[PDB]
Amino acid sequence: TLCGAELVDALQFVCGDRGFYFNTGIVDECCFRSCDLRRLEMYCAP
Amino acid sequence: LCGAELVDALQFVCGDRGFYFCDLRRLEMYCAP
Amino acid sequence: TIDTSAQELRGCTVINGSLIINIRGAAELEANLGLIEEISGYLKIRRSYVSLSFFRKLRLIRGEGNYSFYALDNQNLRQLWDWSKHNLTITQGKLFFHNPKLCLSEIHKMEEDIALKTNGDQASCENELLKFSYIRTSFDKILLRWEPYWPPDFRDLLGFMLFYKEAPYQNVTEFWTVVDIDPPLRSQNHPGWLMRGLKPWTQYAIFVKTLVTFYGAKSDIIYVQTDQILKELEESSFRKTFEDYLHNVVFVPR
Amino acid sequence: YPGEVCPGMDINNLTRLHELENCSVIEGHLQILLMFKTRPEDFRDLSFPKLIMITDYLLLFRVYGLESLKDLFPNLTVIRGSRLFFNYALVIFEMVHLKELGLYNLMNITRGSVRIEKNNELCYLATIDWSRILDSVEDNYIVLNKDDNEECGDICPNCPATVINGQFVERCWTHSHCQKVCPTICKSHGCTAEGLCCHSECLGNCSQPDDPTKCVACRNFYLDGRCVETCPPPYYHQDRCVNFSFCQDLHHKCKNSRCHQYVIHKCIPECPSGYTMNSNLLCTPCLGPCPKVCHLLEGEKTIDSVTSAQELRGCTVINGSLIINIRGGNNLAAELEANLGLIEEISGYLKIRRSYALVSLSFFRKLRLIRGETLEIGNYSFYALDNQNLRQLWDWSKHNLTITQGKLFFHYNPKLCLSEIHKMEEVSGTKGRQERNDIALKTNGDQASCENELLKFSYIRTSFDKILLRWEPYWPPDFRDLLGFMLFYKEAPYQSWTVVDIDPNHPGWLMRGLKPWTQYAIFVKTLVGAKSDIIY
Secondary structure (H helix, E strand, C coil), X not given: CCCCHHHHHHHHHHHXXXXXXXXXXXXXXXXXXXXXXXXXXXXXXX | CXXXXXXXXXXXXXXXXXXXXXXXXXXXXXXXX | CCCCCCCCCCCCCEECCCECCCCCCCHHHHCCCCCCCEECCCEEECCCCCCCCCCCCCCEECCCCCCCEEECCCCCCCCCCCCCCCCCCCCCCCCECCCCCCCHHHHHXXXXXXXXXXXXXXXXXXXXXXXXXXXXXXXXXEEEEECCCCCCCCCCEEEEEEEEEECCCCCCCCCCCCEEECCCCXXXXXXXXXXXXXXXXXXXXXXXXXXXXXXXXXXXXXXXXXXXXXXXXXXXXXXHHHXXXXXXXXXXXX | CCCCEECCCECCCCHHHHHHCCCCXXXXXXXXXXXXXXXXXXXXXXXXXXCCEECCCEEEEEECCCCECCCCCCCCCEEXXXXXXXXXXXXXXXXXXXXXXXXXXXXXXXXXXXXEECECCCCCHHHCCCCCCCCXXXXXXXCCECCCCCCCCCCCCCCCCECCCCCCECCECCCCCECCCCCCCCCCCCECCCCCXXXXXXXXXXXXXXXXXXXXXXCCEEECCEEECCCCCCEECCCCCEEHHHHHHHXXXXXXXXXXXXXXXXXXXXXXXXXXXXXXXXXXXXXXXCCCEEECCCCCCEECCHHHHHCCCCCCEEECCCEECCCCCCCCCCHHHHHCCCCXXXXXXXXXCXXXXXXXXXXXXCCCEEECCCCCHHHEEEEECCXXXXXXXXXXXXXXXXXXXXXXEECCCCCCCHHHHHHHHHXXXXXXXXXXXXXXCCCCCCCCCCCCCECCCCCCCCCCCEEEECCCCCXXXXXXXXXXXXXXXXXXXXXXXXXXXXXXXXXXXXXECCCCCCCCCCEXXXXXXXXXXXXX
16 A cells, blocks of 8 residues: 555656656555556556 | 753763754754764 | 532432433532442433543442433543443443444443444544553653554554653543644654653653544553644645545556 | 747656747646656756746646756746646646746736645745735645745845735745836736836736737737737637637548537637537527536546536536535635536536535526436435535525435534525425435534524613623423523623523523623523524
8 A cells, every 4th residue: 555655656666767658546546445566567658 | 942951852862872063853863873 | 410509419328319410511520529329310411511430439320211321412521431440230220322422442341222323423532552662761851652653544644642641640541731743754763752851750641642534543551650623634635635636647547 | 929839748758848949838738747867967958938828737746857947937927727737727746856936937827826835945935925926815735845844045136025914025036036026007917127017918027018019928819919808700719819710620620530629609619508510610509408418427526626627617417426525725616606507407416525615505506406317325316424614505595406316415514504404305395205314413503503583682771780681581382392591791892602501481690790881792592593683
């Protein structure tokens, strides 16, 4: 369970340098519940 | 915690760590390990 | 029935009349309404705008739709009799509870037609505990520390409330000098607090509880020896909702 | 307006920035965020003086390497604010290593507010006058900054100071520039270098006085580099106006593929209610009731800000939920009425969550009835969870509403009394359907005082030693439900809260304590409530 600014920080651990996508919510799936790396993988740009 | 009691207020926070130069968050790191 | 009536009794051990007391707004009533042991009649609890500590012992209630324990709506009834040494032997009578701040523990420990949803609408009693660690005492001030409790939502906890009061004897009830401590930063330094000058060689009772939004934990009472919130809650909820909306808008899944 | 018009793009790296070096007006929202692998050394090389106008808002979120906005938007003057980002027009969240705000050219904001949060390195908002830029003042949200956490320097660069709270306080934007001061006569047209007022048709600073054709912003409408209130009929109104050719080109660029079809009414992307489209482009009158149905994605939709209900103007029938959950002290009593004013039919349950600022529901003027096709658990059509501050629900004197579906929920309403709920039930006719509703008789009306009675008051002449006065003991109209009377007396201030209970011929009351040439306020309240008058 990751919430707040650190929730964004973990994203920097995942994407690293791939950026973010250009175009319910992330909070309801990662902050309100339990999510893994696979769940939030695609959030970074390919 | 103003003027004179700073020394003996800090002395009982980090222990042997004396000094580094009005809660504890401003007191734990205000001394030299 | 006071807002006097119970003052004329004072030294009475047997009560042959019903209780229709309506005291509303503990130490002041302890002197007079503190020598009651046996009650033979009907007991009713009216509006009490903190705790029912008037009956110190209440060893036996004779009693005699056959209701002996009636509790109406209250605005300041948060706790009840201390369920560690007090004993109740009510034989003839029933149970009827209205008490919105009455926590569920006072109902579950009763075994030592009543509505469940209405009772305990806002039960502000914590279930977990925080054991004290790194206890150091000095001649003038005492510094205490406790383990950090992190809810699933770190923004829910608004800080810490610390209670302290002089108590020469080891019998203290929550029923003051509450001090607010800001929440720490997530990383791991253990939270703690240093107190001001205190009377030497005096026993002190200390316990710390946490405040969270719509959970939490409170520490047990420990003994040591020397030698307007609605606006803030609304602002915190608004900030949390804004942060959640910003995170949802910025972060889009594939 | 030298330059093209940027359609609007969202900004990882600095490669996608050259689109901002040519266009002068962005027809959308500018969003620069998620810039992590950047350094301040490579940032002081690009400048965009062409950007003077922002259509919707400016959002900044975790832009590493940014130090000041002076080299980014030197000529940022006005913002239309047609579309807001959570009822805000300038959001600065989680700023990283910022020092001061470089928007020294900002003069006024048409719509929206400014919020800056999580600024642990920047503290310069104390010397900024947020009064001549945006009309709203209490809607601002300035917390979690370095201003209240550290006593950083607040040095200033000759401009006159501004007084809003105390003595003369200097106002400045950066270290080398300060806020521009305009005379009181220049209410909204700005002031030139010499301070002389210009024509009231150009927003911000004007190059020359009385020169509507020489300015960098148009107050009402822009046409051929000129500021006009209304363009000629050949030109049709995004709030500038363009000719019929632009609208035709936009319409042709939507039918081919992909949509927000553009029509003529003006050039709004949707005809108003009661009109139909035919193959000229004007919104022709419609035959037979045709509602403006606005389908809601995912079904239930929550509203938390102005932008949440922004895409609801002109909607007649909504195929989804309309749960309202707005937090904070900002009372959006005007934006909600403007947006949720044309709503007439709702095909779902109406839910009201915890909303401190929802003092009343006086915005559903056209709401005729609420359907229950998409209900919720418990067969509830009207759900109320917690209304901390709700002293009124509806004006049933002129507004008629009916409910033909399941029960309703009304709990935790300290400021709402039982009289309003009973009136709502009687008007809707639910009580006539013989159904088990959900109304709380304890948590509702406790903090609310709805006497709905005008008792008489027979006042007898008082005395210096004590005050003697009697009141009419109005008996209850059903049996004897009277429990006594409560009397309050604190003071009689210019044009605590102790109470006394009297058991239920006029009973009267006597009090002790009188002072020369003093007035006392005495009133009584019955319990089943009643009131007679407030006197001093």
